Amino acid sequence: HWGYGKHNGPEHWHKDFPIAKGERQSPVDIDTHTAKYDPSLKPLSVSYDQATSLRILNNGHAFNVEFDDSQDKAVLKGGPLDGTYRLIQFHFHWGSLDGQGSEHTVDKKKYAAELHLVHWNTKYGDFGKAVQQPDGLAVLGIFLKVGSAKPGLQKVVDVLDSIKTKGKSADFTNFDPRGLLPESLDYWTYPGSLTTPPLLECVTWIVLKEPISVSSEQVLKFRKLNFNGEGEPEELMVDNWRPAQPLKNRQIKASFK
Numbered sequence: 516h517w518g519y520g521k522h523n524g525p526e527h528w529h530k531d532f533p534i535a536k537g538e539r540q541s542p543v544d545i546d547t548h549t550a551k552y553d554p555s556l557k558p559l560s561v562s563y564d565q566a567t568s569l570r571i572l573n574n575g576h577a578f579n580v581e582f583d584d585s586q587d588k589a590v591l592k593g594g595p596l597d598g599t600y601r602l603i604q605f606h607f608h609w610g611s612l613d614g615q616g617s618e619h620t621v622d623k624k625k626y627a628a629e630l631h632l633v634h635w636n637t638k639y640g641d642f643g644k645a646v647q648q649p650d651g652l653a654v655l656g657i658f659l660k661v662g663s664a665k666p667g668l669q670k671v672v673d674v675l676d677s678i679k680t681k682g683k684s685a686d687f688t689n690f691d692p693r694g695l696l697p698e699s700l701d702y703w704t705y706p707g708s709l710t711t712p713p714l715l716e717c718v719t720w721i722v723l724k725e726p727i728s729v730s731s732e733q734v735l736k737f738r739k740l741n742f743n744g745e746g747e748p749e750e751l752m753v754d755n756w757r758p759a760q761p762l763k764n765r766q767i768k769a770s771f772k
């Protein structure tokens with residue numbers, strides 16, 4: 516039942532998912548002035564050389580690019596993390612207009628979209644068990660602004676026409692997610708949650724400071740996707756973002772300056 520509309524959208528989620536009002540919900544606004552520089556934070560280590568993408572799927576809420584995570588192929592480590600976290604999928608959240616679409620905000624600024632690369636802590640053996648643990652997941656979030664095209668996104672954008680409606684999927688091999696990163700790996704980090712139901716409080720959030728640029732043509736193609744399934748009334752897949760939630764009793768740490 517949950518979704519992103521007036522009747523089932525973020526302000527309703529708490530009724531099925533009481534943790535919506537919990538103590539470590541995501542996303543948040545990143546107050547860049549109150550984020551504490553922490554010289555003990557390590558460089559983030561992003562090892563995507565061996566990533567094996569499998570499939571791309573429209574689930575009715577967003578689209579997911581899935582990876583084979585049955586061995587240590589694409590991993591995130593260091594940064595604020597202990598251990599090794601395996602990439603399982605990436606997805607995006609975006610707006611009906613370029614002035615909104617990101618879930619995290621930076622001194623209240625919305626970006627056109629936000630990419631989330633979702634990784635799970637290999638000490639919990641699989642993703643289902645990891646989401647039940649307070650350090651189960653590390654999600655790397657990257658802002659998108661509109662300007663020049665991102666060449667390494669085009670393969671994603673071109674296949675979207677083939678997964679237009681809910682439940683459609685396509686083969687999606689040999690996609691390299693290093694094509695989606697910006698130059699710098701400076702980050703903020705905080706303890707938070709999934710941003711969609713079940714809203715589990717299991718995420719170490721790592722949000723890059725530097726956005727990537729994507730073209731208006733690229734983001735426009737995102738907005739041509741549908742929330743409905745084939746042969747239902749067209750509801751464009753836009754504004755699939757959860758707004759900033761109360762920071763509460765949490766500190767956002769910066770890797771830089």
Ligand SMILES: NS(=O)(=O)c1c(F)c(F)c(SCCO)c(F)c1NC1CCCCCCC1
Binds near residue numbers: 574579654709718
């Ligand atoms: N937004 S997020 O990065 O915190 C996030 C996770 F980290 C998750 F681990 C999950 S669990 C599903 C894994 O495929 C999740 F749904 C989302 N959110 C969903 C966003 C909207 C569209 C539904 C598709 C799955 C991602």
Ligand SMILES: [Zn+2]
Binds near residue numbers: 606710
């Ligand atoms: Zn997300």
